[PDB]
């Protein structure tokens, strides 16, 4: 039941076209690439 965390200031949403996307509030930017693939 352990959750997988994004780094601080990041959140995931689902776009209307069905793709997940990621908001980086630290830089006020968005990306299709999940940071967790990049740890």
Residue numbers in the entry: 494 to 532
What is the paper's account of this structure, in its own sentences?
Several sets of host cell machinery facilitate this process, including proteins of the endosomal sorting complexes required for transport pathway, which mediates the membrane fission reaction required to complete viral budding, as well as angiomotin (AMOT) and NEDD4L, which bind one another and promote virion membrane envelopment. AMOT and NEDD4L interact through the four NEDD4L WW domains and three different AMOT Pro-Pro-x (any amino acid)-Tyr (PPxY) motifs, but these interactions are not yet well defined. Here, we report that individual AMOT PPxY and NEDD4L WW domains interact with the following general affinity hierarchies: AMOT PPxY1>PPxY2>PPxY3 and NEDD4L WW3>WW2>WW1∼WW4. Comparative structural, binding, and virological analyses reveal that complementary ionic and hydrophobic contacts on both sides of the WW–PPxY core interaction account for the unusually high affinity of the AMOT PPxY1–NEDD4L WW3 interaction.
Attempts to crystallize the high-affinity AMOT PPxY1–NEDD4L WW3 complex repeatedly yielded crystals of NEDD4L WW3 alone. The cryptic peptide binds in the opposite orientation of AMOT PPxY peptides and is therefore not discussed further.
